[PDB]
């Protein structure tokens, strides 16, 4: 059958009276633009991805979509997608980073730390079931190969035990410390303590979440306790410990550290 009746059937009128920002200027991705100063209407964000970044966009698009059914996320205004572009504009989850409360609030890092520790307990406890997202070592290798490949690696990034390492090297290395045994949970994908959004003194939200899917949860753990290293090794510590892990695995931890510097 094919009806073939004549029947017949945005982003403009979303953004009628706000003030405009461009957020995380130096940072790498998608251009981000605050929408703000709009009376009697919520704070929005917009992802603007050209090219390849659109794919990113598109990436963190379905995971909000997907997650926010589990865990409290930024909600989906409005996505377009041309062959080119990807504009992505959500909700903006109100508050401060985790980072920028630690700063803030010196005393308050025990606290702080607990509170990531139970909401990545959360997350993780996500039957893998629900989970329609491949994130795993395997894929995040072939990813990173990719990136190295491309000559898209920032290695002026690197963490200070690789700082001047040739990215083959980390490479290299990094491949020396598998295999490891299998684990899988529901990942965030870049669990920093940019990502996490207190207000009020409680941890509310998650943003960032192209990289959800399933994948060892020291892929979460092992990024988060990296940003911690820049504050305590005792604020690092108790991060294992209120997760409640006794011997945290130094080989899957060093692994997930060389796999993020690739991205
Ligand atoms: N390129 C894009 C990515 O840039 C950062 O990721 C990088 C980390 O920042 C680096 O680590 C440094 O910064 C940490 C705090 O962020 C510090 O604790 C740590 N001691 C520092 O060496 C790490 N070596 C590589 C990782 N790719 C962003 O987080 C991530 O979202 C973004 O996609
Ligand atoms: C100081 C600060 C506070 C928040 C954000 C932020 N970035 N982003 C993205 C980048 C995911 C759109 C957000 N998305 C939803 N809510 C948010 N609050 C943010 C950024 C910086
Ligand atoms: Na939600």
């Known amino acids: 059958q094919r009806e073939?009746?004549?029947?017949?059937?945005?982003?403009?009128?979303?953004?009628?009276?706000?003030?405009?920002?461009?957020?995380?200027?130096?940072?790498?991705?998608?251009?981000?633009?605050?929408?703000?100063?709009?009376?009697?209407?919520?704070?929005?964000?917009?992802?603007?991805?050209?090219?390849?970044?659109?794919?990113?966009?598109?990436?963190?698009?379905?995971?909000?979509?997907?997650?926010?059914?589990?865990?409290?996320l930024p909600t989906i205004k409005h996505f377009i997608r041309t062959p080119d572009d990807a504009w992505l504009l959500t909700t903006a989850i109100?508050?401060?980073?985790?980072?920028?409360?630690?700063?803030?609030?010196?005393?308050?890092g025990e606290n702080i730390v607990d509170a990531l520790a139970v909401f990545l307990?959360?997350?993780?406890?996500?039957?893998?079931?629900?989970?329609?997202?491949?994130?795993?070592?395997?894929?995040?290798?072939?990813?990173?190969?990719?990136?190295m490949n491309n000559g898209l690696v920032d290695a002026?990034?690197?963490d200070d035990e690789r700082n001047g390492w040739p990215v083959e090297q980390v490479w290299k290395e990094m491949h020396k410390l598998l295999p490891f045994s299998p684990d899988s949970v529901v990942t965030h994908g870049d669990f920093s303590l940019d990502n996490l959004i207190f207000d009020e003194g409680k941890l509310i939200g998650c943003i960032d979440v192209g990289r959800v899917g399933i994948a060892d949860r020291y892929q979460d753990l092992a990024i988060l306790w990296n940003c911690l290293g820049e504050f305590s090794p005792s604020l690092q510590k108790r991060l294992f410990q209120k997760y409640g892990i006794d011997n945290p695995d130094m080989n899957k931890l060093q692994f997930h550290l060389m796999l993020d510097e690739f991205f």
């Open 156 to 158: 002026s990034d690197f």
């Open 121 to 147: 307990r959360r997350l993780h406890s996500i039957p893998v079931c629900n989970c329609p997202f491949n994130s795993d070592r395997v894929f995040r290798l072939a990813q990173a190969q990719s990136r």
């Open 4 to 72: 073939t009746s004549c029947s017949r059937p945005n982003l403009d009128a979303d953004l009628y009276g706000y003030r405009w920002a461009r957020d995380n200027v130096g940072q790498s991705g998608a251009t981000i633009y605050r929408l703000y100063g709009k009376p009697n209407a919520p704070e929005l964000f917009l992802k603007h991805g050209k090219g390849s970044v659109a794919n990113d966009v598109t990436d963190e698009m379905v995971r909000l979509n997907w997650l926010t059914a589990f865990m409290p």
């Open 94 to 108: 109100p508050g401060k980073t985790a980072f920028q409360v630690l700063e803030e609030y010196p005393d308050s």
